[PDB]
Design a protein around this ligand. Structure first.
Ligand SMILES: CC(=O)N[C@H]1[C@H](O[C@H]2[C@@H](O)[C@@H](CO)O[C@@H](O[C@H]3[C@H](O)[C@@H](O)[C@H](O)O[C@@H]3CO)[C@@H]2O)O[C@H](CO)[C@@H](O[C@@H]2O[C@H](CO[C@]3(C(=O)O)C[C@H](O)[C@@H](NC(C)=O)[C@H]([C@H](O)[C@H](O)CO)O3)[C@H](O)[C@H](O)[C@H]2O)[C@@H]1O
Ligand SMILES: CC(=O)N[C@H]1[C@H](O[C@H]2[C@@H](O)[C@@H](CO)O[C@@H](O[C@H]3[C@H](O)[C@@H](O)[C@H](O)O[C@@H]3CO)[C@@H]2O)O[C@H](CO)[C@@H](O[C@@H]2O[C@H](CO[C@]3(C(=O)O)C[C@H](O)[C@@H](NC(C)=O)[C@H]([C@H](O)[C@H](O)CO)O3)[C@H](O)[C@H](O)[C@H]2O)[C@@H]1O
Lengths: 258, 259, 258, 261, 261
């Protein structure tokens, strides 16, 4: 039961941070990149290495203790940090033609963010149910051919960084009552990154009843994926490239019953 | 059918929540959500697609709490495609886009469609090629003529069965469907990129200009979907339709009706 | 002089119909298609076959007799019928690559519809003024080089089916006071068809003074072109492909003077 | 100072016309086309011929004479506009280059510029040059005394669009530091394979009033209409390419407004 | 503390100017262009030359002097802005690379970044590197003490845009953790074949007020304008490619606001 909003100067707080991408980081020089992508010769033999798999980013942010009152997330400012870095077309890339500049980062992208008063709830869906996911990742267990469309057994919480592969999990639409999520998948080899930045855009997190996410245990959950596309090396080999996401969340104290 | 007042109170509302799985053809035990590889006929007259190569409309008839006159009225819809990120698997028997590159992602012709109604979706048949021989186990336009390629009014049907009505044969009948709200987009082309948005903050209102939503006859709600996302190209170059499930959340209210 | 709208039960009527496309119909099996498209060696030698030229569609629809009172067209629901037929990529098409599916219908499209209380008024504009238009078509007469940009002599009414080729006629913006018209040309070889369907979308036909088309002699004129693109056969030859268009028009009785 | 609008039946007027494109017209058969585009041997030797340079179109339209007695001005309030002959681009059967073996001709596509303006005086222009060493041909009016700075911004390059078939599109843009008495709208879409997307309707109106509710005020009772509609390039069988343009329709509603001094 | 807006005729002022692009300018003839883009032999040896790197543009404009007697600040309320010389990109004849045999030259296209900001102080920057092992050249101001973490987020890389021709576009973005006194807007469109889409009009206004109705407040009576308008790349006959940029127009309306402490 949700009651009145607390007023006064000390009834509002602000959370501001960046969430770094988790693309796989195949070596000590390649933070923000995945391992080069290899292709299995059969569906059965699909066994992607961990460093070749982008994962969901998550941050649990402790808020000022209130221990009743709960912090209510009201607004979000967000954007991708470092969009201009993708203009580097001179770092040993693949020339688009004889004497031309390097092919810029492009192709399949997934841009996603969520704000919640608890962990993002996930539903597993697999492109290929026989894909063998690597040690150190948390993936849909007991997969069947029905996992390729919908298997209700695959429920999870995004409760660990560098663990939940993007391609395995989506937000669970049957749950997430205490989270607001937003995502766009743009698929295609030649898809151009279109990345907007501005400090003038605000997203309201209140639902139809004027209630935003309520932070259980005084914790705010922020989640992100920003796979911008792929970088193509001189050799033709391709790596996912990701960027950090900025979050600014304004919260207010709200009284709750039971 | 005279529409009267909406019932109020705690017990005057109900909620329907479910998913509709895609029916792309499922050519073997490992390929649920895919069609059979697409083959091309030598001539127009020899077009004879196998059943597992034809995506079909999905449909669910959902029984609602018995009311009886009162009818359940569908007011709002939340919907989205489930598993959009699976299309990031470009490492599973795909065709490299160039030497040493990643696999070609799912792309090309897509049809995304959903409808909410108080009765079965009404269909009109339109054929690309009237001489196409459609396979046993599918329900297709019968007594086809050359006019079926543009508009033959004989081809009327109800979306009343799963794995049955091929997408390429049927569209919602715009001359009917008074008690249904439907929404669809065909994006054609070999290289069309999937653009798939997800969010739990978007609601579609199902009320018409008179403030009346679909009215559920016999206390049944009808949900229909097609989500052909594009084609997957395997290493050999052969191509298969790939579909994904669609989530539906519908809010309904009790409404009194006369006669 | 436009006076008051009549109210009451019988003061409204509805028109519902479909207009079939006229793409050329080169044989008894190819309704909805044009003949294969060929290319003349020069501008002077351009002589398109009748069945290679899509034409405007028109329907004159008689309304309930009134007599002053006139039927006023207020709203329109419209959509292209059979959009899913374009998913037939298995019928004598050209493979996109080795082992691939058939190339779908794509390329130059023209989607157009109008609702009027009289025939759609046309202005002729020619891509090439030396084009010889074939017997059985109604085309701009006494063409000069100025016809390639604007020759005011080329005035016509869309008053016949299978007659007015799409490529040499457009709605006359200097006239059509009693018609509401809407069209989009999307040109280019590889342009993807984007076709939306819904029964929830209504277009209001009233002008800035709140007055819709007024039906002279109790006739409603509906016009359409839906060239969806080109179908490419095995050999690589290309044919225009069209689809039918649904119209639902709501009309009301309006009193007019003189 | 801008005062009250005059009312009554004769306090309103309408201007309706079309502006033809000026693409270069290389011969007696090619109105609406430019000459085939040729590429200079070196960057410094860029020297386009007049008939391969599209130019801005302009018409000055006389309005009903005001102030016969010993001040009223016509004020432009609304605009209806569209490109005339959009369907002509469906001619893919006339001396074109096939898109593939046995295919239809390549349609008009690629770099486009669609522009229109309505003003109570000539459209004011600012010159910007892609290449300052380009030699612009006799018969055109172009930025003079060009320097390397002309490639980005040289404030010397000021002009009025006061002549048809004269001001090359590639040299000139509306001057944003001026044009207080004009409303202008333009879109450049660059790229070799850009699809023309051309909408037509008689239901769309642009309001020409500024934030104070004042439209262009017609000095000397003259209305200035300007346009560019380069739709893209037509590619012939040989592969040579020509700009293709189309006419633009204008309908402007005007009202009498009283002005001080 | 922000108090009331001052009214009267002298309580408003206007700033109008153009910001020229800084693309590299490799020689005396190539203002608005970068040096041709070279590719490093290995990933770790990335070493772009100065004239190959587009930089952020910045202008600080002095406003009418306030507080002559012993606080009023200029408040930026509205902005009109557009790219100047969009039509110049229609020059497809200046020794470019023919799209096909006998075709016109390939137009400027590909990766673009269009950005602008209005603030009462220097735009605040955060550094993000595509490749932390990139050696950035003398004459540029770049993220120092780069680590592998610089490829995603290294909070050490803070800077002010306080110098023209200095801060490379690829190294720096607006810092979203700062910039309280600035309004910024930017779009990156990446990809070799990306078509430039450039709109111009004198009828579009951006309001600079925040949710509390307060615009940028100009410290020391100075207005800061920043821009990047990399439109894409020009391809030479030989296939070599150069960034091409254009100038940006700014018109800013300001009002006097009283401030406490
Ligand atoms: C430095 C480099 O990219 N080397 C490539 C090599 O490139 C050479 C080749 O193209 C020849 C062709 O004649 O040309 C050489 O350059 C010559 C030049 O043309 C000439 O003008 C001049 O005078 O002389 C030089 C000769 O020195 C090129 O140097 O090609 C081979 C075969 O394609 C590559 O081998 C493959 O290496 C793979 C791992 O290396 C990479 C990769 O994937 O390509 C290198 C990337 O730079 C690196 N990218 C990043 C962002 O770190 C990636 C990345 O770390 C991982 O992929 C992440 O998982 O690694 C792999 O071993 C594969 O099996 C080899 O075939 C060689 O890299
Ligand atoms: C003028 C020019 O572009 N020259 C090129 C030269 O082009 C010749 C070549 O294509 C041959 C092929 O057979 O054809 C010649 O023309 C013939 C024509 O085809 C035929 O029909 C006719 O009958 O006969 C003529 C005979 O002349 C062409 O003239 O090709 C070479 C090799 O690719 C180029 O050398 C390279 O030059 C580089 C620097 O030059 C440029 C460049 O990068 O291309 C020239 C650009 O014009 C210039 N652009 C601008 C906007 O200023 C740029 C720019 O200044 C810088 O890049 C900035 O950084 O410089 C470079 O030195 C490289 O190493 C050389 O290989 C030659 O330029």
């Amino acid at each position: 039961e949700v009651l009145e909003v607390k007023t006064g100067v000390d009834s509002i707080t602000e959370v501001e941070c960046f969430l770094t991408p988790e693309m796989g980081d195949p070596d000590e020089h390649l933070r923000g990149f995945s391992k080069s992508i290899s292709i299995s010769d059969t569906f059965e033999s699909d066994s992607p290495n961990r460093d070749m798999l982008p994962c969901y980013s998550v941050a649990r942010i402790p808020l000022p203790n209130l221990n009743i009152l709960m912090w209510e997330a009201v607004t979000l400012k967000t954007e991708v940090i470092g969009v201009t870095s993708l203009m580097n077309v001179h770092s040993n890339g693949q020339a688009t033609h004889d004497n031309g500049a390097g092919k810029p980062v492009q192709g399949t992208s997934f841009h996603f963010f969520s704000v919640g008063g608890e962990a993002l709830e996930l539903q597993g869906v697999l492109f290929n149910y026989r894909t063998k996911y690597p040690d150190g990742t948390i993936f849909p267990k007991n997969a069947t051919v029905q996992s390729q469309v919908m298997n209700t057994e695959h429920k999870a919480y995004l409760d660990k960084n560098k663990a939940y592969p993007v391609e395995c999990w989506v937000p669970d639409p049957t749950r997430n009552e205490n989270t607001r999520y937003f995502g766009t998948l743009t698929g295609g080899e030649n898809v151009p990154p279109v990345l907007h930045i501005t400090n003038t855009a605000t997203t309201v997190l209140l639902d139809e009843f004027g209630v935003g996410p309520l932070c259980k245990g005084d914790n705010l959950y922020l989640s992100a994926v920003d796979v911008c596309g792929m970088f193509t090396n001189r050799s033709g080999s391709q790596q996912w490239r990701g960027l950090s996401r900025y979050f600014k969340v304004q919260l207010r104290k709200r009284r709750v019953k039971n």
